[PDB]
Structures are given as C-alpha cells and as structure tokens.
C-alpha cells in the first residue's frame, strides 16, 4: 500500500511521523512511501535523507492525503486539514477526540478509518504509544515550570532547588503516571521539594520506593490536594483516564488562594485540561494569567524537542505501522487487541465508548465493524 | 553611622542589599538606616516591612547616596550612578572591575572607599560572599541552558535528559568551582550527560567522589577541552581566578565546529567572559547568535530569583556589614584579613593587585592605606 | 605510672574508660593499671578479660582514686566522687564545667590536674575526642525522637517516615556539626523530612552536597528558626561553641506555639542545653512535659549503647592516654597543642578562658602553668 | 443504610475506622452514619469534626452495634464485644481468625456477616487493605527494635548504625513482603547491616535491585536462616501466607544460641507469630524474656501512630466501604472478586478455606452463599 506522511502544520509542530529507518523498512516490505517535502526538516531529517531511504518526495500536502492509503501524522487534523480527510483511508495519529467535538465531527463526516496513538493499549492497560510522549511532556513540564518561575518571566522569582540555607521551590504534581512520574523526577533532580498526589495508592508506593521517600506522596483526597496546591510554587497537572476528557481537579477558586507568581502547568490540556481555568495555548503564546498565577497549557509540548521526541515516538509506533501497512486495518486490529483499542472512527461511526460518553454522542461497538 | 540602600537600577535587577532582619540588627546596634522607597519591592520586601524593622524610607536615590556613610548595593554602579559616588563614603557591593575600565575609573575619580563582595576571601582562599551567587548562577545556568535548547527558542531541539532509548543532552561545564559544580549538579539532575573540566585535579576528584563517577571529569588540556566542546549540546562557562579578568578558553573558531543549535552559557561573563565571542547581555535580551550557536551572557543572573538570591546574598554579607558599620572600614579591615582582601579603591588609589594587572593601571599596596 | 579506671557511677552509665587492648598497651610500656572490679561489666568486658590484659583488679573505688597517678573516667565526677579528688593526680575525662559550677569548684578545691576530653582540639578546630560521642548522640537522638513520637509514649503519634500517601514526621535539627549531621542523617534514613539550621553556611553547604538536597538546609536566622520549630514534630538541639555553655535558642514561649505531642531532644544538655526549658534528665526518667510538648534531656546519651560507645570513645582517647602516661601531663601538653587545649584545672587554677567567662570566675593562662 | 463506627477498645488502640472525609462521602450518597463519642479522639479527630462531616454522635457503644447495618472497626472484636455481634449485620474490620478460635467461634455463633480487611485480595494476589498496615508495622519494627537494643531497655546495648570505626547492628528480616521490605528499608536507613530471607527468590531479586545490593538477600533455607539468626542483634519476623496461621520458623532452641540481649520483633504475631516462643503482648507490656533474649509481640503495632495509620488505613478501605454501603454485602461481593475474597462468616458458616484448615473446622464454599 501507499503510506503518506505530510508536514505537520500545528503551531510549532517540529516532529514527523516517520524516520528514514522506518521508510527503509516499509520499502523493504514492498510498500510505497510518499512524503511532503520539508516534512522532516523540523526534526533535522532532510528531503535527501528521506529520498535515500526509499521515499517518493512530493511537493504538496493535498497530494499525500489523496494518494496515501495509510496516513501517518503526529498530531490531530486541524481546521485546514479537515478538507483532506478521505473515505477508505487509514489515519494513524494522536487524536484527543474527548477534547474536541469539531475534530471528531470531521472524522465522522468524512467517514475515514481512524485509529489513535493515544488509545492503543496493551493487555496490562499500559498505553505504549502515548508513553514516550508523556515521558517527554513530564520532563519538559519541570524545566518549563523552572523557567517560568523566574521573576523575569512574570513568575514568583524562586529558584527550583534553592541554594544551601534558602528554601527550594515547592512542586506539586497531580498524577503518578508516566507524565507525572517524569515531571517529579526532573523537578526533584533540580532540587525542588516534590509532592505527588494520586488516587491509586500503588502508583505512590512505586514512587516511594524508587526515590526512597525523597519524593513525597499524598493520597489525592480533597483535603490533601487543596493543601498541597495552596502551598505550591509550581503545580503540574498530569492525570488521565485512558482516552477520556480530563477531570477538573483544581478549581479557579482554589487558584485564587495560591501564592502570587505561582506557575501551573497543565500537561493534561490535550485531553481537556485538569485545571478549571486552562485553555489550549501554543508555543508562541504559552502562558496566560489566571488570578495572580501563570498558567501554561501547550497541547503539543514534545514539539519543541523533536530530536528527542520524533525518535521517542517512532521507536514506539513503527511496529504498529508495519502491521497496518502489511495487513490492512481490519486484519491488523483482528490480530492485535492492543491495536484494536485505538479504533476511533470508521465510515461515520464512533468506535470508542469513553469518547462517546464524554462528547454525548452515539457509540457503536468496535467488534461490530471487525467482522 | 548611616547605612543607605538604594533601589537597584541595573537591567531587571530585582535584588536588594539588605532585608528587614538586617535593618533590625543595624538599628539595635545604634545605626541609622536609610532605604529608597521601592528598593525591596522586587524581592517582595515592602516599604512597610522595611519601616517596621527600623528603616527611614526616603523618596529619592540621590538622597541615600548623599547621606549614607556606608552604602550597600548588590550590583556595581552604572553610568547614571557615577554622579552619585562621594568622598569619605564606603561602598560595599559587587564590583567586577577587572571587566570594566569605565566603572573602575569612576571609583578612582570620585575618591570613594570601596570594598567588593567578590574579592572578600577567607584563609582557605574561598570567596564566601561570591559563593552563594555562584551557587544561584550555576543552578540557573542548567535550567536556562535546558530552556534555550528547545527548538522553539532557536536552539537544537534536544531534551536535557532524553527519554528511555533516546540520547540525553551532552553538557560540558568548564570549571569545577562553585558555579560549575552547581551547574553540573542540576544538569545531571535533569538527566543530561555532564562533563566537567578544570585545571585543578583536586576539584575533579571531589566531583568524582560526590556523584560516584556519574559526572564525568576531564583534565582541561587543550585536547580534552576542544573535544568536549565540539561534542556538546550545551557548554557552561564557569572559570575564575579571584577578582581577575576571565581567561579566553573557547575561541570563536572552535564555536564554528559546534553542532548547530548548541547553546553556550558564559557564567563568567561578569568577569569578562571566558568565551571569545561573549559580550554582556541582559534578561530582556539574553541571547545573541555566534556562528550557528546561541550565546547566553547575563552578568546578573541571580536577579531573576530575588526570593532565593536576596536571602542567599544577605545571609552571607551581614556579618561583614555589621563589622563595617560598627567599627568603620579602616578598623574593620584591620581586624578581618578576609574583609581586607576586598579593598578595591580609596581616595584615587586602586588597591587590588590583580585588577591593576588586568587593566594595566597603577597598583598601590592595600596595607599602605591601612596605617 | 599508675593508671586507674573506676567503675562509672552516673545514672545508667554503662561505659568504661579503657578496654583490654588499652590495658595491654599500657603494661607493654611499663605502666601499672588498676581497675575497679565490675568497672567494665556494663560494656561486657569481664574482670577476667581485664585481668588477662595485665590489669590489677581492685575491690574498691576509693583505692583506685588514691593509688592512680593518671585517672581515666568517662563522665565528670559526681557528688559522691568529690571526696575522691586528690593533689598531684591527673584526671582525664568528660568534664562539661561551663554547665556545672559545683563540679568546677570541686576540681579547684581538691587542687587536681585535670584535662577534659571535650576540649582537646586539633589545629583545624575539630574536637576528636568529643566527636565520636557526638556521633553516637546524634544517631540516638533520631531513634529516641522516633520512639517518643509514638502516641503510647505520650507524643504526637506520627510515624517518622510516614507511609506512601501519608505525610512523614517533620524533623528540625539545630546545628550542622557532628551531632546534628548524624541526627539528620539517621532521621532522614527513617524517612522523616529533615531541616538543618546553622549559623555557619559552610556546614549547610556540606550537608547540601552530601545528601544532594534531600536534607533541607536553612540559615539559622531568628525568622527561619522560629518557623521551623513551630512546624516540627521533632526538634533536636545540637549546637556548640567548644567548651562553652550552650546558647538558648528555643524559648519556652516558642515551645507554647508548637504542635501538641511534639518531642524535643536537647543533645546540648550536657553543656547547659540550648532549649530554655531544658534541665538534666536521666535514662530512668528521660522526659518531662513543657507546655504541650515532651522534652528529652539525657546528658550521658551514649551510655545506653556501651558496646558501640565504649569502643568509639577509647579508639579516640588511647593515643592521648599513652602520651599522658608515658611523659606526664606537663611534657605531654608541651608536645601536643591539641592535648594542651584540654587543660581545665591545676592546683586551684581554672585554665580554660571560655569556661571562666561562662561561670564568671577567675581565668588563668594555660601557658603560664606549662613552664 | 446505617454505618456505625464504635470506639476501639483493644489495648492502646488509638485508630478509628473512618475519617470526616469518609463520613461526608457516605452522607452524600444518602447513608446514615453513627459514631460513638470519643471514637476518633485517639487519632485527633474530635466529636465536633465528625459532627461537621454529617455524623450522628451517639453516647454508647451498645447503640452503634445495635443500630448499624454496616459496622466499621479497625481491630477484631474482643471478649466484651462478643455480646454485641448481631444477625443481618455486616462487620468490616481486621479479623485474624486463623490466630483465634475464641473469636472465630463468636462470629459463627452470632451468625453475623463478616468480611476481613486482611483477606481482601486483588487479582494479582496483593492484599491492598493489609498493605498499608504492613507498611506501618515494618517501619515501626525497625525503630522499636532500635530502641529495645539499648542497654537501658534490657537489650544488648549496640547502636543501630554503629559509628565510624565501630560495627553497626546486625539485623535479620524474615520475609520480603510489605512488612519485611519496610522494616529492612528503615533499618538500613538507620545504618544497620540488614539481611532479608524469603522462600520467594523474586522478592529478594526486587530487594537486590532497589537498594543495589546494600540490603543482603539470602534464600530462606534452614541453613541460611539458622546462621543469620545466630548472628543477629535484631530479628524481625515478617512472613505470611494470606489469611493463614504463620509458620513457626524460629524455634526456642535456636533462640538459646543467640547473642544475649538480642531483640526479636514478631510482626507476624497477629496471625499466630512466626517465632515458636511468641505470645500476644500489648503496648503497655510490649516485651518478655525468652532465654537471654527480648521478644516484642504487639498485635496492634500501627496503633501507636494513629495520625499516620488511621489515614493510611482509611485511604485504602473507603472505596470498599462505599461499595458495601451502596449495594449491600451480597451485590458488592458479586461485583468485586477482591471484596469477595474477604468473606469470613455468614449465618454460622466459615467461608475462608485457609482459616478452616488452620483451625480444623468445617469450611463452606464462598460462592455457595453468593447466589
Ligand atoms: N501536552 C502534551 O504535550 C502531552 C500531554 N500528555 C497528557 O498527559 C496526561 C497524563 O498522561 P500519562 O501520565 O501517560 O497517563 P497515566 O495513566 O500514565 O497517568 C495518569 C495518572 O493520573 C491518575 N489520576 C486519574 N484520575 C485522578 C484524580 N481524580 N486525582 C488524582 N489522580 C488521578 C491516574 O491514577 C494515573 O496514574 C494525559 O492526559 C496525556 O494526554 C501526554 C503527553 C504529552
Ligand atoms: N553571571 C552571574 O550572574 C554570575 C557570575 N559568576 C561568575 O562565575 C565565575 C565562576 O565563579 P565561582 O564558581 O565562584 O569561582 P570558583 O573559584 O568557585 O570556580 C572557578 C573554577 O574555574 C577554574 N579555572 C580557572 N582557570 C581555568 C582554566 N584556564 N581552565 C579550566 N578551569 C579553570 C578554577 O580552578 C576554579 O575551580 C566567576 O567569574 C564569577 O564572577 C558568579 C556569580 C554570578
Ligand atoms: N547528651 C550527650 O550525651 C551528648 C551531648 N553532646 C553535645 O552535643 C552538642 C553538639 O556537639 P557537636 O555536634 O560535636 O559540636 P559541633 O561543633 O560538631 O557542632 C555544633 C554546631 O552548632 C553550631 N552553632 C553554634 N552556635 C549556634 C547558633 N547560635 N545557632 C545555630 N547554630 C549554632 C555550630 O556552628 C556547630 O556547627 C555539644 O553541646 C555536645 O557537648 C555531645 C555528645 C553527647
Ligand atoms: N503486628 C501488627 O501490628 C501487624 C502485623 N502484620 C503482619 O505482618 C505479616 C507480614 O505481612 P505482609 O508483609 O503484608 O505479607 P506479605 O505477603 O507482603 O509478606 C510475607 C512474605 O513472607 C514470605 N514467606 C512466607 N513463608 C515463608 C517461609 N516459610 N520462610 C521465609 N519466608 C516466607 C512470603 O514469600 C511473603 O513475601 C502478616 O502476618 C501480617 O498479618 C501486618 C501489619 C501489622
């Protein structure tokens, strides 16, 4: 089949959905790869590098979309991409539908087959394609939090790890999953006092073991959450129920009680945000004021470190890309229950139950379109 | 005596040279404290907080300078402050004269007694007043380096500590002193691969012990330095001979061989900078391009975290402030050889030998004006 | 000469001032060793073990004191021992005179040569004979603090290191010296949140390095001390100016603001105690209430672990014992400036300056009785 | 339904089975909560705090028992509570029936529905309601062991972590589960030399990884066990087969070979004890001599740190409490196989197989009374 990779068009989205090695593996298996010129330049993969690997370098975005049977993107389609979505085409990318009705509508109306990176889930309930992006996001969250805590950035003017004799930043991380563990670890590495909350005690028990008590763990009860946030120089929001709109855990009213110049980073923004006052920002304009605090809500965080994130992503996605290309979406999903869990849309039907309940929209069973 | 503390006027300089507790201790010992209104507002010390402690809150900068017997600043005097410097007044602040002729000339022409925070040196050769600022600078260097390595900041687009399976940033720190140790430690905390160079093997042996080999140490030979730099995603410049103009260790020619998008942070900028292509920058305009790299050269780095740095600084300086105010500069310097080593100017005479050799200007013996 | 070691008679004092190996080394050098029967039974050194090594096992305490030229004790003489002190005898033991007038008076009236373990001081200002006892005391402080924080002991009923999800004990250690470093280290080992204060920034910088920021360090300003204490579940008092009465750093008024059931351990009790409400307690009756808190003030803490402390002590003291016995106090002190600094009393003369100022009693120069 | 929480009456039992937040969540779901006055005072939850949350504060224990449909306790019923057990009432608490026939008899004769915290078991075989109590018990075991090792407590008089130059305590932990891992970790934190034995090599492999070899691991063969114990200053007994009477692993005969003053802490005492010579003690009288050793056998260890343990417990139990209250025991157990595994007694029938074999008493299948 034809596998197409367009240039990413989201704000400051420098990643790409495939690397030369993946292009070379596709063409070894007798597949046709088409790639928009420049598509990899943000990740420092040239058109030449792609050409060498076996790719057909095309001049226009509209051509890739129209030709490609399997389409590989990093981010969700945006407004100007809605007109590109076809029928009988397989879209494989991050989707975050629970967070956007306007996007979900487009995939349904065009009737395209779509599977979502972020809902591919292995038997043990782990999400192996979101994982490395959560990894990148958690780590960015800490340094980005550190940076915006500088007075010069409008923030409070506390240094992350203090210096001997002078107290370090107080960091609160909500969620002990991949993103939250990774944020806590970097922030702790910067010398910050870190507290992680979660409703899953096992997650905290893991964190208690790994850092031998150096990262504080609190059960995410209303009482403990409120107290932590009221105290925090920096709050990082990192919760998730797989493929569901984030719950609202930090109210605007709570934010009014916070230290002036506190920074809040809502990693969960891509799935709705878990702060009441969050709204999607972009790398160009990353922050906005709420009360006396600074909010940071970039939905494509990994985008600023494409050398790292492009390879982190594609290391994980390729085995799944190969199976789609080799066997087609129906057979691939039939042979892989983890791939199947990612099925989002097919011919005007929404195949995720969770996303159907969050949007208030008709759900149809996945196993029903797999026979 | 009268002890005056003006508002800082350097770019984004949010620090102050005294805190309430210091004001309170001065007034217990029967001293008169005068403070420019707003002088502490950047460090979140109100005029009221200062009032409460025993300070006379004055409306203008020109009055403090004119009244104050002992004058306490954080940074060196700048152009618009040159007209404030008097005779028979003691100036106590960061000076960095080896790096500025125009500043040094002003102190000599005004005929003012000046001691420099950064050349106060104990018996073991440590600089206990520079120390905490080096601590803050080192730690800022790492996070600031992390931030500017993001593609969105023009940098290379590598994440500091990578993510599992994908290589972390390569960080090279030149100098194993206070700043460099602290830079290495935060950088290493962020998951970066860190290499520290120094011409003092002892310093590296300390670093090798503390992190049990996790921070790489290389003897700063021409060979090892050039190889480290050529390989680095981020170079942090942190060298010092006490009170002397920095040596030029990284040539512009070397920088041309570096990875495009590499960031270079010259902590040593305040003492001339140890990169050949360095020039003083500010928090407003922190970075300039040199070849295909990005340079960061802020001479007052600690300014962005006054909540941390103001207290770090004043924790250290007060015991010395008290001795100056209690006994006057001549007796204080006679009783404290560590205070003495800070003597810079008195009545048109330059009293530091090193600063005299770096500027090519007449040196006069300190012990000669102390009798 | 004759070297005598009495049984310790202080409350629960299970230590002894010599071990078999030390007895054996004394007798090799042609010295006569006399030891009160049972003197080592608390440290599990039998009369037989002592016999075997070369000691004359004597039946009574009064005989040892009367015969012995050099007398080796662990603790200071107590009331019933005051009648034992002779002229021309060298007493070598812990003294803590700055804290007891009635003890100091006894040494002056008896006219005895006395050197104090705890004021023997090397060139770098370290106290190598107090050191290991501070080590034992610091480590005891943490576990003893842990134990008395249990509700069943009257304390607050918080567990030292919490458990995942639930906050650990908040421990505040005042002083970053030997005792305080060791207290902080064990406490932190137990999972407690530890904060160390000190007026010597260097000491905190060492602590910040060693535990890589995991033990919090605060500069011991009035502001920071009061805030730490008000917050602490357990405060450990560990300050010292060599051989001087402890300064009073925690007032009774402050203690009234503390969490009910907080425990306070004043390691410094032996030198006066650094808590205002402290008074010497014993192992039998270790704790008294002050306000809604519980105080622990045992002046001979190491006594409860003689198997550890006896050898810790004697490991350190022997080289000094040998020099005393070999050359006599006058020649030994002339050849060792570190031994010299321990001189306390000789023939009715108080030879420590600091102890003279704390007691308000006539001081006489050490070097004057060494010629 | 009515959910009742009596005051705990066991020796020094300061915990409570519910906290305000849990009371508030129950009353939100339309349930009636009754709480014996004073029931929470040991955990510092006032009657007022409970009232505010929505609880009906009742004066007497007999009323709660009689009214409550779901009854929440921390510990097992004791002699004076046997007369309180009703029919058609759900008891939810720690039970430890394999260890007490007299208790098991009462639940059977009264015919009460009972589920046990300690046998609630998730699919992966983990016991999530015992877990946090094992956590608390392990950590207490180490400090309690440290304390009783002091000479003054009758113990051997070795300090846990020694001091430089002098050997630390030798600690042997039998069982690498939750309690044993937590004991080893605290003891290691105190500087003790720790050895953990287990018949499950994976458990030891986990411990070998976490502490990177610093905690010694030995396969719990007869040979290795004997040798460790013979050498130990402190032995902590921490084994378990879920809901079964502990195996006897340390014979009285072995104890005769041990160092005099050695302390043995049998955490497993609540399930019979794994030391041959153990017998239930209480916080009032915690220890008894066996041979030349000191045994410590408190069955309600977590009781002395109720601030920690009450919240540790209820954090875990509440989700299960809510399900019982919402749906009743039959439906709740039907929807939750982990809840179901806790079923102990119903209408005169013993529903645990393990407890039936240990007691030698008729077992009846759980699934049989769930239809
Ligand atoms: N902005 C960006 O560029 C990126 C955002 N993300 C987002 O980060 C979020 C976290 O992702 P992961 O860490 O992989 O998920 P995860 O499942 O690894 O972690 C989420 C954790 O939050 C906890 N949690 C759920 N509900 C909670 C509540 N009410 N209170 C407290 N804790 C709660 C869960 O127990 C879970 O462990 C996701 O929403 C993901 O979409 C991920 C990558 C990049
Ligand atoms: N930008 C800012 O805001 C601040 C800048 N600084 C600057 O940071 C610099 C370093 O300060 P500290 O770490 O306190 O000094 P330090 O003395 O602690 O460390 C400097 C180290 O550089 C080493 N060094 C000297 N010559 C060298 C050579 N040719 N090659 C390799 N290594 C060499 C020395 O051996 C020494 O260990 C100073 O120039 C200081 O003024 C300090 C504080 C703030
Ligand atoms: N109860 C017992 O059985 C024992 C008690 N001790 C006592 O422990 C105390 C501490 O001993 P070490 O740790 O060896 O002394 P050290 O000299 O190692 O440490 C004392 C520390 O307290 C600091 N300090 C002094 N004044 C201060 C102030 N105003 N505020 C804050 N910090 C201040 C010093 O800078 C020093 O670092 C001594 O009084 C000693 O006699 C020692 C052994 C046993
Ligand atoms: N006294 C108190 O207050 C408390 C007592 N406990 C008791 O602590 C005990 C341990 O509990 P957990 O650590 O949660 O159980 P666990 O299952 O986490 O740990 C027990 C470990 O012992 C090992 N083991 C079993 N048989 C063995 C044998 N013959 N030789 C060597 N190792 C063996 C198992 O492999 C298991 O890993 C339980 O009996 C529990 O009831 C728990 C909490 C409080």
Swiss-Prot record, chains A, B, C, D:
The keyword Magnesium applies. It is an enzyme of class 1 (oxidoreductase). Its cofactor is Mg(2+). Its EC number is 1.4.1.1. Transmembrane segments: none annotated. Relatively stable, it loses only 25% of its total activity after 4 hours at 60 degrees Celsius. The enzyme is much more active at temperatures above 37 degrees Celsius, particularly in the reductive amination. The velocity almost doubles at temperatures between 60-65 degrees Celsius compared with 37 degrees Celsius. Above 65 degrees Celsius there is a sharp decrease in activity, due to thermal inactivation of the enzyme. Pathway: Amino-acid degradation; L-alanine degradation via dehydrogenase pathway; NH(3) and pyruvate from L-alanine: step 1/1. GO terms for biological process: alanine catabolic process; L-alanine catabolic process; response to hypoxia. GO terms for molecular function: alanine dehydrogenase activity; metal ion binding; nucleotide binding. Optimum pH is between 10 and 11 for the oxidative deamination and between 7 and 7.5 for the reductive amination. Binds 1 Mg(2+) ion per subunit. GO terms for cellular component: cytosol; extracellular region; peptidoglycan-based cell wall; plasma membrane. Induction: Upon nutrient starvation. The keyword Acyltransferase does not apply. Mg(2+) binds at residues 323, 327. Keywords: Magnesium, Metal-binding, NAD, Nucleotide-binding, Oxidoreductase, Secreted. InterPro entries: Ala_DH, Ala_DH/PNT_CS2, AlaDH/PNT_CS1, AlaDH/PNT_N, AlaDH/PNT_NAD(H)-bd, NAD(P)-bd_dom_sf. It catalyses: L-alanine + NAD(+) + H2O = pyruvate + NH4(+) + NADH + H(+). It is found in: Secreted. Substrate binds at residues 15, 75. Inhibited by CuSO(4) and ZnCl(2). PROSITE patterns: ALADH_PNT_1 (PS00836), ALADH_PNT_2 (PS00837). Homohexamer. Trimer of dimers. L-alanine dehydrogenase activity increases when the M.tuberculosis is shifted from aerobic to anaerobic growth conditions. PANTHER family: ALANINE DEHYDROGENASE (PTHR42795:SF1). This is Alanine dehydrogenase. It comes from Mycobacterium tuberculosis (strain ATCC 25618 / H37Rv). The gene is ald.
């Amino acid at each position: 089949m034809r596998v197409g990779i367009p240039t990413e068009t989201k704000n400051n989205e420098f990643r790409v959905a495939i690397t030369p090695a993946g292009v070379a593996e596709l063409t070894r298996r007798g597949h046709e790869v088409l790639i928009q010129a420049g598509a990899g330049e943000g990740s420092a993969i040239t058109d030449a590098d792609f050409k060498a690997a076996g790719a057909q370098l095309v001049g226009t975005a509209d051509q890739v979309w129209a030709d490609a049977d399997l389409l590989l993107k990093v981010k969700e389609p945006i407004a100007a991409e809605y007109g590109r979505l076809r029928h009988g085409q397989i879209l494989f990318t991050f989707l975050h539908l629970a967070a956007s009705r306007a996007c979900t509508d487009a995939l349904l109306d065009s009737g395209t087959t779509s599977i979502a990176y972020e809902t591919v889930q292995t038997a043990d309930g782990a999400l192996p394609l979101l994982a490395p992006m959560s990894e990148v996001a958690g780590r960015l969250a800490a340094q980005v939090g550190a940076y915006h805590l500088m007075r010069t950035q409008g923030g409070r003017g506390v240094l992350m790890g203090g210096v001997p004799g002078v107290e370090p930043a107080d960091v609160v991380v909500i969620g002990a999953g991949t993103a939250g563990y990774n944020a806590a670890r970097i922030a702790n590495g910067m010398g910050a006092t870190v507290t992680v909350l979660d409703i899953n005690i096992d997650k905290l028990r893991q964190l208690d073991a790994e850092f031998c008590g150096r990262i504080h763990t609190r059960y995410s009860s209303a009482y403990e959450l409120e107290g932590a946030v009221k105290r925090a120089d920096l709050v990082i929001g990192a919760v998730l129920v797989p493929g569901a709109k984030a719950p609202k855990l930090v109210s605007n009213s709570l934010v009014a009680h916070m230290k002036p110049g506190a920074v809040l980073v809502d990693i969960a923004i891509n799935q709705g945000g878990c702060f009441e006052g969050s709204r999607p920002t972009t790398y160009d304009h990353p922050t906005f004021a709420v009360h006396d605090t600074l909010f940071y809500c970039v939905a494509n965080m990994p985008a600023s470190v494409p050398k790292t994130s492009t390879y982190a992503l594609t290391n994980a996605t390729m085995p799944y890309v190969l199976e789609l290309a080799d066997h087609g979406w129906r057979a691939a999903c039939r042979s892989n229950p983890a791939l199947a869990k990612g099925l989002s849309t097919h011919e005007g039907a929404l195949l995720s139950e969770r996303v159907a309940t969050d949007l208030g929209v008709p759900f149809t069973e996945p196993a029903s379109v797999l026979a």
